[PDB]
């Protein structure tokens, strides 16, 4: 985790969302009530990952529980690359407890870069609630 790593999170994401800030310091050590905030407002700005959560789940104080906190991050990394054919190296457990933050943002880079090409996710998302 670096400033390389936070200015290339700015640059995926920084045009297509323009909430929750973008800064080095939530970047540095994101919660996950921040990520979300960055997912939900992703799907409600652009509709990538539309569908992939419900209303209740759309909603943060509805995923407060460790599992459902799990969960929803796995959802995001499966659908992003599905979508994308990258790799991903974020665990979502890892993720929950503080971890990695280099590879949460990776995340949230791809998930910019699918935003930016207009790349649906539909098919994906269907898949992946499938299971």
Same mark, same amino acid.
């Given at each position: 985790m670096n400033a390389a790593?936070?200015?290339?999170t700015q640059e995926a *994401?920084? @045009?297509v969302i323009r909430r929750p800030p973008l800064t080095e310091k939530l970047l540095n050590k994101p919660p996950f009530?921040?990520?979300?905030?960055?997912?939900?407002?992703?799907?409600?700005?652009?509709?990538?990952m539309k569908g992939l959560y419900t209303d209740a789940e759309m909603k943060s104080e509805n995923v407060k529980d460790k599992d459902?906190?799990?969960?929803? *991050?796995? @959802?995001?990394?499966?659908?992003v690359m599905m979508v994308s054919g990258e790799p991903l190296a974020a665990k979502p457990a890892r993720i929950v407890a503080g971890h990695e933050p280099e590879r949460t943002n990776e995340l949230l880079q791809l998930i910019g870069k699918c935003c930016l090409s207009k790349l649906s996710s539909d098919e994906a998302v269907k898949r992946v609630l499938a299971g």
């Open positions: 790593v936070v200015r290339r *994401l920084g @045009k009530r921040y990520l979300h905030d960055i997912i939900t407002e992703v799907i409600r700005i652009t509709g990538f459902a906190k799990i969960s929803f *991050l796995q @959802k995001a990394i499966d659908v």
